[PDB]
């Protein structure tokens, strides 16, 4: 299925992540449909940059966030917006 | 040439050839064919060890060895330095490089590699001739 998940980048022991829309079958760092945000856990308040409109459109289209992306979208309130849209 | 002539028969640059061809071809025992592999050095066995006479300007007894390489090609290689321990059936390593004096010698036998002992008493440019720092 279509997944919204973290593609790891950066260097050894210095992780960074791009929140990207990708098919669940594709490799973690390989083919992906589209990038939607970034996520740097090394900052005390994990820094997140997000394309909320793109995320909401994909969620409506049926994209399934991973667990960490679900936490990220909850903290950004995107999950609440999607919930309201479903209602 | 006219532009139309060039279209009909385009330019073709000369083909360049290595100065040490024996190092550019490997061997495959299974298929018993030669491969195209670029190697910095190649191992061989001394089929004959002796001396050679230089070209006209020079006169000496230049020490050489006829070596069959790992790819089954026989070549002639020079033995740099003063004195050596090489006999026939000795396993040696060959590097590229011509010897201007000798007619058909294109390779040097690396000193300090495999059976080739370094040059005794060498103290300057020791990395060449393969002698340990004393």
């Amino acid at each position: 299925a279509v997944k919204i998940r973290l593609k790891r980048m950066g260097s050894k022991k210095s992780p960074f992540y791009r929140i990207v829309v990708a098919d669940s079958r594709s490799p973690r760092d390989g083919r992906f449909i589209e990038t939607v945000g970034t996520y740097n856990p090394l900052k005390d308040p994990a820094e997140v940059v997000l394309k909320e409109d793109l995320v909401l459109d994909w969620l409506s289209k049926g994209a399934q966030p991973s667990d960490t992306v679900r936490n990220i979208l909850s903290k950004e309130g995107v999950m609440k917006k999607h919930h309201e849209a479903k209602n | 040439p006219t532009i139309n002539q060039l279209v009909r028969k385009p330019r073709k640059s000369k083909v360049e050839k290595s100065d040490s061809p024996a190092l550019n071809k490997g061997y495959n025992s299974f298929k018993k064919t030669q491969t195209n592999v670029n190697s910095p050095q190649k191992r061989g066995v001394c089929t004959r060890v002796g001396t050679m006479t230089p070209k006209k300007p020079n006169s000496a007894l230049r020490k050489y060895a006829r070596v069959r390489l790992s790819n089954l090609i026989e070549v002639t290689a020079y033995i740099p330095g003063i004195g050596h321990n090489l006999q026939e059936h000795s396993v040696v390593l060959l590097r590229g490089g011509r010897v201007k004096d000798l007619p058909g010698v294109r390779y040097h036998i690396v000193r300090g590699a495999l059976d080739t002992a370094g040059v005794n008493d060498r103290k300057q440019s020791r990395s060449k001739y393969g002698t340990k720092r004393p």
């Binding site: - | 532009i3 139309n4 060039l6 279209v7 385009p10």
Partner: protein
Amino acid sequence: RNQRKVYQGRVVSDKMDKTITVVVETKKNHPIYGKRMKYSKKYKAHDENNTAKVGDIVKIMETRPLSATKRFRLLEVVEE
């Protein structure tokens, strides 16, 4: 609605029934020397009633494969 590629050409073979061979006759610059060269590409187009003859200027629109080589449909006979 999406458009299918259409080509203008000259018929060069009609001995085959229900079909024709068309030629495009373009010119392209030689990649190295830049001289304009006569480039000829020919397609096998489907004629419903063998209306077109040899040496006729016609138009053909690409279609689903109609045979082993056919990929085009005859549209008009611009000249005879």
